């Protein structure tokens, strides 16, 4: 139950949330509407959990890739900006928040990873991933190290896995082919093998996470790191003389970061939708709104035309965009969730030596493409066609015809007016259900299936 007459906002702890609370303070002075900004751990996972129950924040901030999965589950309210407001933002940022033709969030800023390097330790950063080993040897002799970045989040090693040909979902004919996953190709294997070898050869440590990497770099202990615009603020404070540059190449190919668009979605269950729209359009997506957040932690290339024209000067923003151009905008499809989880596991397992690169990426392939599901599905498809065959054979005037719904239940041929029961599916989306319970569907008097199927009685097995 979200409170009426206030706004609760969730954003990630690495972003400029104090800047955001300032914009929220301006909103409160003006409207008397209290704006609370929170930054929970694992917010992109908590949101769909709590929002599923009519609970959580009024507004949610994350990169667009998760938003497709949210909109699909019906958790985001459709946003309604006028023509004039849409002209204020770059078209390609709107594209990233479009799901099913509907706009489901406000674009805020474009984020891409870049190479960040210590100009005092390395006046000339390497142009290639391949020089890094030797470079680390030179620096270990000075009690330093070459490179540290977050090895726990697949987002950071992706650029290198993608460099030589790894990809998420194959794009063509305006569509991502969810049956064509590129996580286990020659390129992906090459990229991950190089990373694993860095670790085997002790040029990196498999434990290294975000805080370890950030602290080492800002303390002048490592020469290079890989991070986004939000990270520059802390480097400014640390007084390290740093550059932001193009990511190193791998086998002559550019590193291909997955480009994010930070976005603001409104909770479908929030009773304060107007207040949220009012806050986002008239307060945050203004030069003053954005500047307030950017001065806390840099946003990257902002979605607002009039403010980006100022930030475009900054060579750090220039670098961000060059890396963004050599990478690729993230898909926003619901399957991105499963893709990231698969690749997280692959990288962690391969890095720790629990699995070889081949084993790790094979399992990733199978998870990311949901092959267990495609395989199961086609069995249920076969079976349902057989049930039809048998009916027809024995038979040889107005029924609902055998179909298979999107859950995998095969509704047999049934008489007009019949309420049909089938056992609950044994498996659905990685969850097992109690099959001694039934699902229910009506075959209408006109020989057509009711569009709604009652699955209310199907409990998971916990």
């Amino acid at each position: 139950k979200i409170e009426e007459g206030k706004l609760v906002i969730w954003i990630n702890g690495d972003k400029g949330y104090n800047g955001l609370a300032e914009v929220g303070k301006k909103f409160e002075k003006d409207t008397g509407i209290k704006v609370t900004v929170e930054h929970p751990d694992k917010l992109e996972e908590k949101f769909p959990q709590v929002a599923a129950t009519g609970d959580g924040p009024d507004i949610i901030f994350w990169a667009h890739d998760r938003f497709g999965g949210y909109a699909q589950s019906g958790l985001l309210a459709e946003i309604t900006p006028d023509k004039a407001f849409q002209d204020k933002l770059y078209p390609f940022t709107w594209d990233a928040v479009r799901y099913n033709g509907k706009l489901i969030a406000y674009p805020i800023a474009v984020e891409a990873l870049s190479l960040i390097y210590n100009k005092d330790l390395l006046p000339n950063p390497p142009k290639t991933w391949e020089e890094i080993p030797a470079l680390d040897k030179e620096l270990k002799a000075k009690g330093k190290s070459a490179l540290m970045f977050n090895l726990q989040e697949p987002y950071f090693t992706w650029p290198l896995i993608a460099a030589d040909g790894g990809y998420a979902f194959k794009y063509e004919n305006g569509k991502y082919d969810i049956k064509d996953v590129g996580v286990d190709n020659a390129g992906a294997k090459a990229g991950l093998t190089f990373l694993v070898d860095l670790i085997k050869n002790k040029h990196m440590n498999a434990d290294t996470d975000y805080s370890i990497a950030e602290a080492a770099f800002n303390k002048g202990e490592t020469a290079m790191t890989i991070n986004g615009p939000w990270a520059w603020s802390n480097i400014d404070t640390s007084k390290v003389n740093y550059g932001v540059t193009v990511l190193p190449t791998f086998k002559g190919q550019p590193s291909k970061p997955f480009v994010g668009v930070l976005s603001a979605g409104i909770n479908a269950a929030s009773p304060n939708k107007e207040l949220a729209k009012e806050f986002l359009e008239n307060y945050l997506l203004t030069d003053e709104g954005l500047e307030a957040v950017n001065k806390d932690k840099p946003l990257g290339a902002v979605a607002l035309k009039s403010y980006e024209e100022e930030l475009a000067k900054d060579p750090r923003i220039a670098a961000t965009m060059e890396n963004a151009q050599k990478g690729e905008i993230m898909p926003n499809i619901p399957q991105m969730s499963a893709f990231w989880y698969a690749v997280r596991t692959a990288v962690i397992n391969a890095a720790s030596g629990r699995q070889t690169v081949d084993e790790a990426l094979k399992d990733a392939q199978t998870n990311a493409a949901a092959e267990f599901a495609a395989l199961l599905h086609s069995l249920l498809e076969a079976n349902c066609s057989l049930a039809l065959a048998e009916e027809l054979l024995l038979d040889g005037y107005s029924y609902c015809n055998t179909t298979l719904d999107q859950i995998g239940t095969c509704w047999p041929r049934s008489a007009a007016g019949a309420l049909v029961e089938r056992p609950c599916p044994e498996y659905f989306n990685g969850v097992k259900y109690n099959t001694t319970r039934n699902a229910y569907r009506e075959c209408l008097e006109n020989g057509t299936w009711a569009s709604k199927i009652n699955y209310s009685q199907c409990e998971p097995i916990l």
Binding site: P48, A52, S73, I407, N429, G430, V431, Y455, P460
Partner: peptide, 16 residues
Amino acid sequence: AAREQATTNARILARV
């Protein structure tokens, strides 16, 4: 989690 995945399924099953 098997907790997270079950409740997110519950949504799709209310939907369909």
